[PDB]
Amino acid sequence: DVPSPPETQKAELEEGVYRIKQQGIFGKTQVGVGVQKEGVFHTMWHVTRGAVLTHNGKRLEPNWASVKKDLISYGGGWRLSAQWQKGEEVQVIAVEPGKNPKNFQTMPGTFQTTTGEIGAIALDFKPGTSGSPIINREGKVVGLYGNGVVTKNGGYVSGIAQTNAE
């Protein structure tokens, strides 16, 4: 903690799920997805690599970033407080490039670590879906989709990427 914390521009976005677009080869394309909640925009670190977001004539810098957790928030600290509970089904609001958002329901498995346990989503969406929210039956975001592993048989399994709310 410090006496005079620095200030970034506010994420002036309505709550909801957003496509994140980047200028690249071929022009502007959807690189990933993010979730605006309580004035803070949340996505996966690998999607933006901490780049500035621009909206409403304002340049938005990340307020919190962790490469290790693969998560990043703009406009403030992490606000997604919900946790996945083992044995409960979730939905992913998959926002694929060029497609209408669609909800997919699944029962997560688990990834094992010496640290602890992380939910595992065996769903394989198109590139550009990273940052799509994983939600519980209350409509709360328990994590973000898109940091995963390719299994020996070519199947994709995503972690449920989450951190504690500030």
């Binding site: 976005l13 799920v17 677009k21 977001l53 992913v92 997919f104 329901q105 039956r137 409509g139």
Partner: peptide
């Protein structure tokens, strides 16, 4: 510099696609 565009609201859909 990245831009954003709204695509959806956060909702559980009772007839979402099964199954994962």
């Amino acid at each position: 510099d990245l831009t954003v565009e709204k695509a959806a609201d956060v909702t559980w859909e009772e007839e979402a696609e099964q199954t994962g």
